[PDB]
Amino acid sequence: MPREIITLQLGQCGNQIGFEFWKQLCAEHGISPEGIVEEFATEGTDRKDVFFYQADDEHYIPRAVLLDLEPRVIHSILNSPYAKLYNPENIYLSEHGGGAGNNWASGFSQGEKIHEDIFDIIDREADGSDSLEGFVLCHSIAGGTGSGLGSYLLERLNDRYPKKLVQTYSVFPNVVVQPYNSLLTLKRLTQNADCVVVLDNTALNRIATDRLHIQNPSFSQINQLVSTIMSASTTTLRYPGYMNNDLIGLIASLIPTPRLHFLMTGYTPLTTDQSVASVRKTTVLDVMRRLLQPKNVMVSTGRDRQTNHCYIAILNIIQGEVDPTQVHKSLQRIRERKLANFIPWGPASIQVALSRKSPYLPSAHRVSGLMMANHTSISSLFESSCQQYDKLRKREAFLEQFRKEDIFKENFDELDRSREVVQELIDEYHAATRPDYISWGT
Amino acid sequence: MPREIITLQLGQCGNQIGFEFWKQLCAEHGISPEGIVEEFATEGTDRKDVFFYQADDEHYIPRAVLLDLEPRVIHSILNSPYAKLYNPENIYLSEHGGGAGNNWASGFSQGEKIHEDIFDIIDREADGSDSLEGFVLCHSIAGGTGSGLGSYLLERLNDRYPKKLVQTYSVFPNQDEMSDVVVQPYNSLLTLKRLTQNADCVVVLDNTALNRIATDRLHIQNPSFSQINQLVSTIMSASTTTLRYPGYMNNDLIGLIASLIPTPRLHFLMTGYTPLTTDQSVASVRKTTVLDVMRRLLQPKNVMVSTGRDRQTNHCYIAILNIIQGEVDPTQVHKSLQRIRERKLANFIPWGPASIQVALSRKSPYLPSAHRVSGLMMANHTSISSLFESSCQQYDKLRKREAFLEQFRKEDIFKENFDELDRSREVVQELIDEYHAATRPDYI
Amino acid sequence: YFLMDQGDFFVHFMDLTEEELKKPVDDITPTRLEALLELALRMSTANTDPFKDDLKIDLMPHDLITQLLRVLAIEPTELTLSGLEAFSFDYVVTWPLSLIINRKALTRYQMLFRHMFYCKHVERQLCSVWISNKAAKRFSLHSAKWFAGAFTLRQRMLNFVQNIQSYMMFEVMEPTWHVLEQNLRSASNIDDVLGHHASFLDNCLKDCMLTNPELLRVFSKLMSVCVMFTNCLQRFTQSMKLDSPQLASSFEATITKFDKNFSAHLLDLLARLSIYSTSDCEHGMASVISRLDFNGFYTERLERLSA
Amino acid sequence: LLGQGDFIRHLMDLLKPELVRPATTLYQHNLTGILETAVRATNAQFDSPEILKRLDVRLLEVSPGDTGWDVFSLDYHVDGPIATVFTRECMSHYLRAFNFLWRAKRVEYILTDIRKGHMCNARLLRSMPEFSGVLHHCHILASEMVHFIHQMQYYVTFEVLECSWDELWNRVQRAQDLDHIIAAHEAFLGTVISRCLLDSDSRALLNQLRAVFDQIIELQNTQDAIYRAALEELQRRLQFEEKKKQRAAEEEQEKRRVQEFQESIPKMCSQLRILTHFYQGVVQQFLVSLTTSSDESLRFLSFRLDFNEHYRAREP
C-alpha cells in the first residue's frame, strides 16, 4: 500500500514552494516536466506512489492542488514546462480575481467561499490514496490567501481528519496588516496544524547574501532553497531502512507534538556551485559542526540575552554514502562536547538516519544532512510576532480592511484570542527553556 | 598533520604579493591557474595539505583571503589566471574604492570597519583547517590600506588565535627614495608598532631592495611590479619548500618559528636568496659547494633587505638557518659548516645561543630549477634595527614637522592626538634599542 | 614509521598523542594511541606510503634509558611510567620476510624510535616554552627580569638541542641508512643482504653511543632539566594569565639551578664523547663539540672543563 | 540490520497503532500488509526482488506477559545458494540479531517519545509554572538515561553491526571458495552476536538493556498520565473561566482545582523523583557491570558514558 502525501499550495509563495517541491521530486524520480518518467528513471530508487499520483500512460502527476486568488501565478505555472506534470483537475482557482486584500479575515472568508472546491479535491485525494499519511500546506503567514485560506484549510483538515498529521510550510516574514496576519497564522499553526516549518525570509536572504555573494538576492533563490529543503524532508522516505519515515513520526520528532509545532530547519552545505569548497572531506563531525553553526540555521532567531534557547528535539536525515561508525562517532562527539544543548525537561533526542539519495539527482556534496530541530529559539520569532501584533492592535493599525470583513465587522475578539494564544506559546517555549517544562503546568 | 597557513593579502601591494604567492604555490604543487591539479602532481608524497587546501576537484586552492580598500587590485586578481585557483568564498572586495589615501590611520579604520567580514573569513578558514598552524599577513607598511588594515587584521588574528604562530610579510618603505605618500613615514611607524606588539614575527620585504637586486643581479633596468610580484612568489615558494617536502627535521611552522626567532622582541628574521642572476646570465653549471652556498647566503649582495651598515655598532646575527633545496649531500653541508666555523664567515650574537642550522630538502619536481642546489638564508640579526631606525627617522621627520599629519588627524585614531604615531615611533625605537642590546653582550 | 622519515606523520602523531601518550601507562588508552596514530597517518603526508597503514603504536616493557643502561650493564614501581615514554612504532613480519626480520634488529629500531619520540617531545616542549616566553616581548621589557634568565636558558637549551639533533640526524642515523642501502645494493644472496643490513645497524649502534648507561643517564638528566625549566615557565605563564614542584617553587633561581644541572650533564656527555673520540679515531664527538661550540659560547667551557 | 531509514521506519510508524497489541492478537495478514505498505513506501519495493521475496515477518511462540512488538520481526529467507550461504544456524543468529535490534530501536524510540512528550507538554499546558520544582528532578535523570541509551545505540551500531558488515563485505570481496564464504558469514554472525550482548554471560547485559527500556517506558507512562490529568484539570478550569467570561460556583470550582493541583504536585514530584533515582541507579549499575567486563567495546561504552562523570559522580 502506497503512502501518498497531499500537497496544498496557498498563495503565491505557497504555490511557488509547491511547484518547486514538485519539480525537485520529479527530478529525483527522473520525471520530465510533463510528468513522464525518463528513460534513465526506469530504475529510479524512489517509488513515485509515495509522493505523486501516476497516470495511466506512466505519467507522474503530483498530488498537489494549487489554490491562488490571482490568476497570474496559475497562468505562469500552466505556461511553465511543468504544466503537463500537474493534473488540471486537482487545481482550483477562484473566478473572482479580487483576492483577500491583505486581510486575514477576508482571506478566511474567501477560503470559506471556495471551501467546496478545496474540500472536494481533498476528499478525492484521500479516497484515492491507499495510505495517505497527511497533507502539507505551503503558504505565507503574511499573505491573504496563504494565511486566511491556509488557516481555514488547516481547521477543516483537523476537523475532518483529526487522526491525520497536518504539516505546514509557513513562510515566516523577514503589508500594514502583516502583524495581524502573522499572529493569526501562528495561532492557526498552533491550534490546527500538527507541525509548522518556519521559513524566515530574512534568514534566507541573509544566508543567500552571505554565501551566494548575490547582491540583492531574488525570490527565485529563496524558492529554490525552499524546494531543496522540502526535498530533504522527503529524503528520509527514499532509502529502505529502520526508523523515522512517517510524516506523523517526523512531526513528532522535529516538532515534539502538535502543541510544540514550531520547528527550525537546517541545511548544509550552504555554498554555491561556483564556490569550490576547499577539498574538505565531509566528515560526520564537520557536517555536524556546519549544521550547528548559527549562520547555517534557516531561522532568524533573536540573540536575546534574557532567554537561554536550547534544543528540544533533533532529527537529522543524512543522505549519501555515510559510514555508520562515522555517524555514531559524530553523535558521540557532539554529546561529549555538549555541542547541542538538549532540553533539560526531556531526554536528549538526537536521531541520525542514514538514507540513500535519489539515483537521478546529481549531488555536489558526497554527504548531505538536513536537521529538523524543535528549539527554544523559535520562541524569539514568536516573541517578535507577538510584539508586532500588540503594536498593531494598540494603535488599531491596518484594521480598516479587517473591519470590512464580516468576521471583524463587530469586534476583533478573534484577534484578541490569537494574541493571547501567541503570548501563551511564547511563555510555554520559555518554560521549555526551563527543566520544569515537562510538568510545567502539566 | 597539516600545519595550515591562512594567506591574508592587504592593500594593492599586498594583494599583488598574495596573488603571486598563490600562483607560485599552484606552480610548485602542479596546480593549474584554475586550481585544477596537474596530472603529474597527483601522486606527490609532499604534505600538500600543510601548505594548500585542495578544492572539490582535488584542485589546489590556496586558503588565501584578499582584502583591499580599492577595487583595482581586486579586479586584477579576479581577472588573473589564478582567479579560479582561489576559492570564491574566501575573496572579499570592499565596495568603497576610496581606499585609505596612503594613511595608516585610515587603513586601520577600514580594517576595523571590515573586521566582521575579515573575521568571518578567518573563522571559516580556521574551521575548515584540521590542524591550522597560523596565518600569514602580507601587507605593505608604506601604503595606507596595507599598513593600517594590515595592523587591524593582524590584531584580529592575534586575538582570535593566540595558540597560532603569527607571521607577517611586511613590505618596508623605501628608505632611500622619497616616498610619494607624505604620511608614509607615520604609516610605516604604525605598521612597525603593530608588528612589534601583536605579531610574533615580521619579515621585511623591501621593494627598493627588490628593485636594487633586480638591477644589480638580473640587470633589470626599472623592474616592473610584475617582476616584484614574481620575485615575491619565488621567495614564498622557497620559504615553504621545507613545509612542502617531508624532511627529517623542522617539518612544521612552529619549529621554523622557534629556530628563526631566538628573541621574542627581536624575532624579525631577514631573508637572503641564491643564486640571484638574470636568465640572460647563464653561469655555466656553477657547482655550488656547500661552503660557496653559505658564503652566498651571508653575502650582502644576496640579501633582499636594505640594512644600514652602521660602523658604530657591531651588528651580528642572533640566529642563522640555511635551507638548501635540491640534491645536497649532508656531508657537503657538514663540511661547509666546519669550514665556516673555522673561517668565521658570520658573526654570531654574543648574547644569543649558538644557532646555525642547515636543512636538507628537495626542490619541487614541477618547478624548473636552473641550479641543482639553491640556498636561502633566514636569520634573526640586529642589523635589521638599522632599517627600523631608518623608518623611525622618516616617521620623526614627518611627526616633528607635522607633515602629512592632516590625513592621520582626519581619522579617529589621530583626531584627538597623535598617540598612534607616537606609539609607532616608540615601538620602532624600543625594537632598535633591544637590537642594539642584542648586538651587545647584555642581551641575555 | 620507525625512523620518522615522513615528518608529516610524526608531527600528526605527536599532536594527536600529546595528551594521550603523556598520560600514564594505564591512563593512556592503547586503543586511543592507535586511533591517534591512524589519524596522524591519514591526515599526514605518510598516507602517500603504500604500507603506511602497516605501522602501529607500541609499548616498551621498560624505559628507553633504563633499557639502554641495563643492556650496557649486561653481565617499574619506583620509576615514573608514561605513555609518551612507552610510545613507539611496531611492525609485523610475514615469511619469508618474517624469516628475514628478527627481534634483535626490531628491538634496536624500537629503541631508536622511542628515543626519537622523546627528543621530538623535548624539542616541542622547548619551542612551547619559548612561545609562552614571548609574552614578555608584548609586555614591558622592564618587568621580565626573572623571566629573562628563563627565556635565555630556554633559547640556549633549544638551540643546543637543535644543533645536537641536526648533527646526530645527519651523521649517525643517516650513515646507517646509507650503509644499509649501499650494501644491500651490493648484496646478491641472503647472506650478503644480511651482511649489508648488519653493517648498517652496527654503524648506527656504534655512532649512537648506546654502550654507556652513564651517558644515557646524563642525556636523561639534561632532558629532565629542560622539562623542569619548561614546566616552571609554563606555571609562570599560567599564573600571569590567571592574574590578568621544585621548578614551580621559584621562577629564576630554580631556572638557574636547572640550567646548571643541564649544562653539567651536557658537559659530562661531551667529555665522555671526547674520550671515546680520543680512544676509538671517532670524529662524532669532535663534530658534536663543534656543533655545540659553533659560536664559542660553550667551546671555552668545554675546553676549561677538560682540564 | 536496520541500516537506513525509510522501510522499517514506515513499518514502525504503522506499527505504533498496530504492533503495540498483544502478540496473540498479532495477525500475520496484518503484519504482512503493514510490511508491504512500508516496502511500497520505501526502497524495499525497489530493492532486489529476491530480497523482497525473502523478507518476511517472523513471530515466535506465544507466551503470557508479552506484546506483539517483541514478536513481530523481519526475516530474510535463504534458498539455493542463499541457503548454502545462510544455514539454519545463520537463520537463528539473524533472528536473534533482529530481535535485539528491534528491542534497541524500541528503547530508542521510547526515549525519543518521552523526550518529545516532555518538550511538548512544555508547550501545550505551560499556562501556570507553579509546579517548577517537580519536573527538573526526574528530567535530569531521564536525560542521563537517554544519554546512556544513545551511547548504547551508537555502540550497537558499530561495535557489532558495522564491524560485522565491514568484515563480511571484505570477505565477500575476497571470497574464492564456498568454504571461505561460509567461514566469513559465520565470522560476521559471531561478531554481531558477541558485540550485541547475545551471549550466556551477557544475559545480565541484555536484561539490563531490557530493564532500562522498561524503566524508561514506565517513566514515560507516568509522565503521560500526569500530563493528561493536569491537562484535564486545566481544561476544566478553562471551561469554568470561559463560562464566567460568557456570563461564584465557577470561582469555587477553580479554587478547588488549584488546591487539588497544589496537593497532587507532591505525589507527581515523588513519582518523578523515584523514576529519576531508578534511572540513575540503572545507569550506575550498568556502568559498574561494564567496568568489570573484559570486553574493550563495553569498556569504551562505559568510558564514553562516564567521560563527563555523569554516572561517575553518582557511582564513585
Short mmCIF file of N, CA and C in Angstrom, two decimals, chain C residues 42-85:
data_model
loop_
_atom_site.label_atom_id
_atom_site.label_comp_id
_atom_site.label_asym_id
_atom_site.label_seq_id
_atom_site.Cartn_x
_atom_site.Cartn_y
_atom_site.Cartn_z
N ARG C 42 46.61 9.23 8.35
CA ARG C 42 45.64 9.57 7.32
C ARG C 42 45.72 11.05 7.00
N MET C 43 45.93 11.89 8.02
CA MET C 43 45.90 13.34 7.86
C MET C 43 47.30 13.90 7.65
N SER C 44 48.26 13.05 7.30
CA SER C 44 49.64 13.46 7.09
C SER C 44 50.09 12.98 5.72
N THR C 45 51.28 13.42 5.32
CA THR C 45 51.83 13.00 4.03
C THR C 45 52.24 11.54 4.02
N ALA C 46 52.30 10.88 5.18
CA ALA C 46 52.67 9.47 5.18
C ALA C 46 51.61 8.60 4.53
N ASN C 47 50.41 9.14 4.27
CA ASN C 47 49.42 8.34 3.58
C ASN C 47 49.89 8.04 2.17
N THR C 48 50.88 8.78 1.68
CA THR C 48 51.44 8.51 0.36
C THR C 48 52.19 7.18 0.34
N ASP C 49 52.65 6.70 1.49
CA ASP C 49 53.34 5.42 1.53
C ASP C 49 52.34 4.28 1.35
N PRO C 50 52.57 3.35 0.42
CA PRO C 50 51.60 2.26 0.25
C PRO C 50 51.43 1.43 1.51
N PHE C 51 52.51 1.24 2.28
CA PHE C 51 52.46 0.47 3.51
C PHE C 51 52.37 1.37 4.74
N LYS C 52 51.77 2.55 4.59
CA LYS C 52 51.68 3.47 5.72
C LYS C 52 50.76 2.93 6.80
N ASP C 53 49.77 2.12 6.43
CA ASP C 53 48.84 1.57 7.41
C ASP C 53 49.43 0.41 8.19
N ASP C 54 50.59 -0.11 7.77
CA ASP C 54 51.20 -1.24 8.46
C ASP C 54 51.77 -0.86 9.82
N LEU C 55 51.96 0.43 10.08
CA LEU C 55 52.54 0.85 11.35
C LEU C 55 51.48 0.86 12.44
N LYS C 56 51.92 0.63 13.67
CA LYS C 56 51.04 0.62 14.83
C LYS C 56 51.76 1.22 16.02
N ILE C 57 51.01 1.47 17.07
CA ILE C 57 51.55 2.02 18.31
C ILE C 57 52.08 0.86 19.14
N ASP C 58 53.25 1.05 19.74
CA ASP C 58 53.90 0.01 20.53
C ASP C 58 54.25 0.55 21.91
N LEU C 59 54.25 -0.34 22.89
CA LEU C 59 54.57 -0.01 24.27
C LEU C 59 55.78 -0.82 24.71
N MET C 60 56.82 -0.12 25.16
CA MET C 60 58.04 -0.77 25.60
C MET C 60 57.83 -1.43 26.97
N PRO C 61 58.55 -2.52 27.25
CA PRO C 61 58.42 -3.14 28.58
C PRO C 61 59.10 -2.34 29.67
N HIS C 62 59.96 -1.39 29.33
CA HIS C 62 60.67 -0.59 30.31
C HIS C 62 61.04 0.74 29.67
N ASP C 63 61.59 1.64 30.48
CA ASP C 63 62.01 2.94 29.98
C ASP C 63 63.15 2.78 29.00
N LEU C 64 63.20 3.67 28.00
CA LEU C 64 64.24 3.57 26.98
C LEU C 64 65.64 3.75 27.57
N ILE C 65 65.81 4.76 28.42
CA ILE C 65 67.10 4.98 29.08
C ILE C 65 67.42 3.84 30.04
N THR C 66 66.42 3.36 30.78
CA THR C 66 66.65 2.23 31.68
C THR C 66 67.08 0.99 30.91
N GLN C 67 66.44 0.73 29.77
CA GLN C 67 66.81 -0.41 28.94
C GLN C 67 68.21 -0.25 28.39
N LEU C 68 68.56 0.96 27.95
CA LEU C 68 69.91 1.19 27.44
C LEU C 68 70.95 0.95 28.52
N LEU C 69 70.68 1.42 29.74
CA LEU C 69 71.62 1.20 30.84
C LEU C 69 71.72 -0.28 31.19
N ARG C 70 70.58 -0.98 31.24
CA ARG C 70 70.58 -2.40 31.58
C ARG C 70 71.33 -3.22 30.54
N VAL C 71 71.11 -2.92 29.26
CA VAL C 71 71.80 -3.64 28.20
C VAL C 71 73.29 -3.35 28.25
N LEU C 72 73.68 -2.11 28.56
CA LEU C 72 75.11 -1.86 28.65
C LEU C 72 75.69 -2.58 29.86
N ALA C 73 74.94 -2.63 30.96
CA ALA C 73 75.35 -3.34 32.17
C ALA C 73 75.07 -4.84 32.08
N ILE C 74 74.81 -5.36 30.89
CA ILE C 74 74.57 -6.79 30.71
C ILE C 74 75.82 -7.56 31.11
N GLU C 75 75.72 -8.33 32.19
CA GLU C 75 76.85 -9.10 32.69
C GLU C 75 78.08 -8.22 32.88
N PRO C 76 58.82 -1.71 37.80
CA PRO C 76 58.84 -0.29 37.43
C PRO C 76 57.96 0.56 38.34
N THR C 77 57.91 0.20 39.62
CA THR C 77 57.10 0.93 40.58
C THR C 77 57.78 2.21 41.06
N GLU C 78 59.11 2.23 41.10
CA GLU C 78 59.84 3.40 41.58
C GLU C 78 60.19 4.40 40.48
N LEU C 79 59.95 4.07 39.22
CA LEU C 79 60.23 4.97 38.11
C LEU C 79 58.92 5.37 37.45
N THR C 80 58.76 6.66 37.17
CA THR C 80 57.52 7.12 36.57
C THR C 80 57.35 6.50 35.19
N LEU C 81 56.13 6.06 34.90
CA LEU C 81 55.79 5.44 33.63
C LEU C 81 54.76 6.30 32.92
N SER C 82 55.00 6.61 31.65
CA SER C 82 54.05 7.40 30.88
C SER C 82 53.92 6.83 29.47
N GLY C 83 52.75 7.07 28.87
CA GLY C 83 52.55 6.59 27.52
C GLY C 83 53.47 7.28 26.54
N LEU C 84 53.89 8.52 26.85
CA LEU C 84 54.84 9.20 25.99
C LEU C 84 56.18 8.49 26.02
N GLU C 85 56.59 8.03 27.20
CA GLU C 85 57.82 7.27 27.36
C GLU C 85 57.75 5.94 26.62
#
